Enzyme design. Structure first.
Site, PDB file in Angstrom:
ATOM      1  N   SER A  67       9.273  20.472  -2.146  1.00 39.37           N
ATOM      2  CA  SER A  67       9.668  19.216  -2.825  1.00 39.37           C
ATOM      3  C   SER A  67      11.145  18.922  -2.520  1.00 39.37           C
ATOM      4  CB  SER A  67       9.374  19.317  -4.299  1.00 39.37           C
ATOM      5  OG  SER A  67       8.001  19.661  -4.478  1.00 39.37           O
ATOM      6  N   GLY A  68      11.605  19.279  -1.323  1.00 35.82           N
ATOM      7  CA  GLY A  68      12.923  18.885  -0.783  1.00 35.82           C
ATOM      8  C   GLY A  68      13.994  19.890  -1.141  1.00 35.82           C
ATOM      9  N   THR A  69      13.576  21.122  -1.394  1.00 37.81           N
ATOM     10  CA  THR A  69      14.412  22.195  -1.970  1.00 37.81           C
ATOM     11  C   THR A  69      15.557  22.554  -1.000  1.00 37.81           C
ATOM     12  OG1 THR A  69      12.217  22.887  -2.837  1.00 37.81           O
ATOM     13  CG2 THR A  69      14.277  24.233  -3.324  1.00 37.81           C
ATOM     14  N   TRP A  71      16.805  21.073   1.772  1.00 37.12           N
ATOM     15  CA  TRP A  71      17.680  19.920   2.077  1.00 37.12           C
ATOM     16  C   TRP A  71      18.620  19.687   0.890  1.00 37.12           C
ATOM     17  CZ3 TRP A  71      18.515  14.951   0.214  1.00 37.12           C
ATOM     18  CH2 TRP A  71      19.085  14.028   1.092  1.00 37.12           C
ATOM     19  N   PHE A  99      17.486  32.766  -4.191  1.00 40.30           N
ATOM     20  CA  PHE A  99      16.164  32.364  -4.734  1.00 40.30           C
ATOM     21  C   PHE A  99      15.807  33.375  -5.817  1.00 40.30           C
ATOM     22  CE2 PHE A  99      11.507  31.579  -3.051  1.00 40.30           C
ATOM     23  CZ  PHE A  99      11.131  31.075  -4.277  1.00 40.30           C
ATOM     24  N   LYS A 149      18.496  28.786  -6.720  1.00 43.98           N
ATOM     25  CA  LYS A 149      17.216  28.083  -6.430  1.00 43.98           C
ATOM     26  C   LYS A 149      16.115  28.752  -7.244  1.00 43.98           C
ATOM     27  CE  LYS A 149      13.700  28.097  -2.675  1.00 43.98           C
ATOM     28  NZ  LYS A 149      13.353  28.566  -1.321  1.00 43.98           N
ATOM     29  N   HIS A 151      11.655  27.896  -8.344  1.00 40.88           N
ATOM     30  CA  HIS A 151      10.466  27.031  -8.561  1.00 40.88           C
ATOM     31  C   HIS A 151       9.897  27.265  -9.965  1.00 40.88           C
ATOM     32  CE1 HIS A 151      10.909  25.899  -4.439  1.00 40.88           C
ATOM     33  NE2 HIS A 151      10.421  27.013  -3.952  1.00 40.88           N
ATOM     34  N   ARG A 173       8.196  15.513  -5.793  1.00 45.01           N
ATOM     35  CA  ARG A 173       7.649  14.949  -4.532  1.00 45.01           C
ATOM     36  C   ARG A 173       6.165  14.653  -4.740  1.00 45.01           C
ATOM     37  NH1 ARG A 173       7.781  17.813   1.510  1.00 45.01           N
ATOM     38  NH2 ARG A 173       7.408  15.902   2.677  1.00 45.01           N
TER      39      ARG A 173
END
Ligand SMILES: [Cl-]
Length: 334
Positions: A67-69, A71, A99, A149, A151, A173
């Site tokens: 989902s554009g992580t 970038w 992460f 980072k 999720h 996204r």
């Protein structure tokens, strides 16, 4: 004290998941009422993940996978480090922007295969061993502002994140592009070890039997926090459609101030043409934990709004799944 139930996936579904997902060798768990899906090590690390201590000057990026992580991480690290392109280039993003829960996805029996394949290089073997250790240990040791980072959905974040009002960037996204990209992620990462085709993967994804699912609960939790002063929610397609606005808006949210000239260099850096050659897109490759046979999608991406894996039947199911889950909400993808 970890507040939510952790239960192994029902026996037969768990057996089928182990046939299709070779990155896990014990089984899969569902967490709490929403049945957040993880491999077995979540049960081992749930307490240490949840009691991780956020700091008020941390910057967290929270997304559903693909989902554009990457970038966003590159954009955010640069905005918070005076656009230091030279440092961004020389230090891998995984060290600059660790992460939090990656270690969940390194199963002891799969790690043993990685070590066998790298048995003649001590440095490769130390690297692989470190992958299996919580990023939290080295994060706790940092004495400078941290870039994390995850999720993990809002409801599974360490409560210390909202307690400390750490800044969160949440990126959503559209499920069509997520399904296809996440399918490719599952083939690229041997820690996932997915062997099947897109349709079988979509079936798992639609049933919330992929890591960090349920997808729709992930999005709704992100949407339900976007009004907080320390949360910035953006849609992937909005961010990519107008880099200058995305960069300025993100910079302003983070309390940073840049010239037109500086914004322009960041537009160039983050352009799809230049970003395709960015190091953060291509260490994991060198020890063979990335599947080198699956770099097709990394190099080329998908046909915009018509992935070749997509079928009219899957398109229709994505539409109906979207309708069932977004009905009676004000969530709308661009
Ligand atoms: Cl989108």
């Amino acid at each position: 004290p970890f507040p939510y139930s952790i239960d192994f996936v029902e026996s037969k579904q768990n057996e089928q998941l182990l046939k299709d997902f070779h990155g896990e060798r014990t089984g899969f768990v569902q967490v709490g009422e929403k049945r957040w899906f993880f491999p077995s090590r979540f049960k081992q690390y749930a307490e240490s993940l949840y009691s991780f201590e956020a700091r008020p000057d941390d910057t967290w990026i929270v997304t559903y996978p693909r989902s554009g992580t990457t970038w966003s991480q590159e954009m955010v690290w640069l905005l918070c480090n005076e656009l230091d392109f030279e440092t961004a280039k020389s230090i891998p993003l995984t060290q600059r922007f660790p992460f939090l829960e990656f270690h969940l996805f390194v199963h002891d029996e799969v790690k043993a295969e990685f070590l066998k394949e790298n048995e003649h290089d001590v440095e490769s073997m130390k690297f692989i061993e470190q992958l299996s250790q919580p990023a939290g240990f080295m994060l706790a040791e940092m004495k400078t502002p941290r870039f994390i980072k995850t999720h993990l959905p809002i409801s599974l974040l360490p409560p210390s994140v909202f307690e400390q009002k750490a800044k969160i960037i949440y990126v959503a996204r559209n499920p069509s592009d997520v399904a296809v990209s996440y399918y490719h992620l599952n083939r690229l990462y041997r820690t996932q070890g997915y062997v099947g085709d897109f349709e079988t993967f979509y079936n798992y994804f639609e049933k919330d039997l992929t890591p960090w699912s349920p997808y729709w609960e992930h999005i709704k939790e992100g949407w339900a926090e976007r009004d907080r002063e320390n949360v910035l929610f953006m849609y992937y397609e909005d961010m990519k459609r107008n880099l200058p606005d995305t960069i300025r808006k993100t910079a302003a949210f983070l309390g940073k101030s840049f010239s037109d000239d500086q914004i322009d260099t960041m537009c160039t850096h983050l352009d799809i043409r230049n970003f395709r050659h960015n190091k953060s897109v291509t260490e994991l490759k060198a020890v063979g934990i990335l599947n080198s046979g699956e770099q097709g999608f990394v190099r080329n991406g998908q046909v915009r709004g018509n992935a070749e894996e997509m079928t009219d039947d899957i398109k229709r199911r994505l539409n109906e799944w979207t309708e069932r889950n977004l009905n009676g909400t004000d969530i709308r993808f661009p």
